[PDB]
Design a protein around this ligand. Structure first.
Ligand SMILES: Nc1ncnc2c1ncn2[C@@H]1O[C@H](COP(=O)(O)OP(=O)(O)OC[C@H]2O[C@H](O)[C@H](O)[C@@H]2O)[C@@H](O)[C@H]1O
Ligand SMILES: Nc1ncnc2c1ncn2[C@@H]1O[C@H](COP(=O)(O)OP(=O)(O)OC[C@H]2O[C@H](O)[C@H](O)[C@@H]2O)[C@@H](O)[C@H]1O
Ligand SMILES: [Zn+2]
Ligand SMILES: [Zn+2]
Lengths: 299, 297
């Protein structure tokens, strides 16, 4: 339990990052880093997806990604799946690409399934897609588990055909993680190793409202500084009934005892630009975004 | 490793040793079922399966602070509909721990007061999910306290309570979803869990935070005995899990070292351990005496 930051501010963190002790950075990201791109997050008021599902007549919004409700009524999820089937990465994404190219990125653990991380240039080794992906789909039966490709899933989706296994006739779904579902093994293999020697955590665009992902901030050493770049504070709350975080497993930005957590409130993109400038990468970042976006438009 | 075998017998042997000086009990609604009080989440019998008459979006809503401010009628309806019972053998076993200087603390999620009626004192107790005894206005600015008498009159009168000052809702200090827990929970927690030699967990599903976190707060060497109808706290990780990652029980893996599950009724598990400890007759005599006294208006 050591304080490495000279001051609990973005500036202090930048200074720390340009030190030699800071070699390994883990990024923890959610849907907030993609809103600037046109993709809605989940729990933002009025705007968020969970406030926009009335037409599916769910008992509650999370039901649409809940494995039991799904097996019982899979039609809504696939309707929503086609209703929301291109986007470009954000400055946040390319800031993470920069971290990678500057040899500071041990890993990015993401809750998103938009693939903007890959598109931003991150490779699979760099990525833990904590909540799955659409690229591959599987028959839900544990015996069968027959794999099916993205082309097949699309066909079924836009063909408005509820996918079934050609073999067992069971339901087939994309390997995105539903509530009640187990997370990809890679999530666990990479976590056991990654968090033992991490020098900085960068949390961005997440409300930290789901487990086990929320536990990740607790897995880092107590000395490891943690910076949240988010429109609102997350992970900091007094203990209340139904809280997601484990007791003492959250962030401490403001208490008298606060020593390693820093909260920059605003758009992810602007926090990333600010940090870059403090680091001296602002024009390199800008040029990376203009170039990549340009190269994208050409396609 | 402190337990010689992961069995009730190994726990009893450990408890008779000199290394077991302080015991913390963690209890839930399952320790009160044998007295006629239903739990929350047991299928069909549990309360959350018996709230259809209130037409809730989900059962927990009836104890959720937001739905409550929007729709306070169902709660009070239930509050009078569920407004006497006697403590069970499990409660008196905890009283027995108290009488033998082994009980550091009992943390309870229950609000039925059978722990007090059973003979536990305020200092022995952490009522983690509050109490019906006192009631407060929901406004943080107001926070006008009201007595049990006030709340009863209002409830049995079918009168939705309002604050005399701000006209906002008034509710008993039982902890709803979204509500902060009593400060004493955290103050007692910080000190208690540095010096606990045994966790005894009874009659809870460990499905709500921050109470579920308490098992992770104990030292890694401290044995943990669950006495419950079903195994609790031991699950593979999944999206939506309540437990923090690695914060649960390990009864059955190859790496298990300290956690033991005794599956059955709480009263029978307490009788079995008592027997093992040589306290069974003393326990049965305590229960008989105190129940007799109770019957005596
Ligand atoms: N443009 C932005 N700039 C900065 N912060 C933002 C921005 N947009 C949103 N935020 C903040 O970003 C946060 C977004 O909160 P949430 O929408 O809950 O997204 P999640 O990724 O954490 O959801 C996790 C899981 O929940 C689901 O069940 C799925 O399983 C998901 O995988 C909020 O604090 C916003 O204020
Ligand atoms: N007679 C019995 N003997 C042994 N175990 C029993 C018995 N009866 C029930 N059980 C077990 O007892 C366990 C009771 O499970 P739950 O019904 O969730 O009660 P909680 O106290 O943990 O609820 C915690 C909070 O949740 C609410 O929101 C309130 O806020 C509560 O404070 C089950 O596993 C049964 O198998
Ligand atoms: Zn199949
Ligand atoms: Zn008031």
């Amino acid at each position: 339990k050591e304080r490495l930051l000279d001051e609990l501010t973005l500036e202090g963190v930048a200074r720390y990052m340009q030190s030699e002790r800071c070699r390994r950075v883990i990024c923890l990201v959610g849907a907030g880093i993609s809103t600037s791109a046109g993709i809605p997050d989940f729990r933002s008021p009025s705007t968020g997806l969970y406030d926009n599902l009335e037409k599916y007549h769910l008992p509650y919004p999370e039901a649409i990604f809940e494995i039991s409700y799904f097996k019982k009524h899979p039609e809504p999820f696939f309707a929503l799946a086609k209703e929301l089937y291109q986007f470009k990465p954000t400055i946040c994404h390319y800031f993470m690409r920069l971290l990678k190219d500057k040899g500071l990125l041990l890993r990015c653990y993401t809750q998103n399934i938009d693939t903007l991380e890959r598109i931003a240039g991150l490779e699979q080794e760099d990525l833990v897609e904590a909540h799955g992906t659409f690229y591959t789909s599987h028959c839900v039966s544990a015996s069968c588990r027959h794999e099916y490709p993205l082309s097949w899933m699309k066909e079924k989706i836009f063909s408005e055909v509820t996918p079934k296994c050609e073999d067992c006739q069971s339901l087939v779904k994309p390997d995105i993680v539903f509530f009640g579902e187990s997370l990809p093994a890679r999530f666990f293999s990479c976590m056991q190793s990654d968090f033992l020697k991490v020098d900085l955590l960068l949390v961005m665009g997440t409300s930290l409202q789901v487990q086990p992902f929320a536990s990740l901030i607790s897995k880092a050493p107590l000395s490891t500084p943690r910076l949240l770049i988010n429109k609102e504070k997350a992970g900091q709350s007094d203990p209340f009934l139904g809280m997601i975080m484990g007791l003492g497993g959250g962030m401490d930005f403001d208490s008298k005892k606060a020593y390693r957590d820093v909260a920059w409130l605003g758009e992810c993109d602007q926090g990333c630009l600010a940090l870059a400038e403090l680091l001296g990468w602002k024009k390199e970042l800008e040029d990376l975004v203009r170039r990549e976006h340009a190269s994208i438009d050409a396609q």
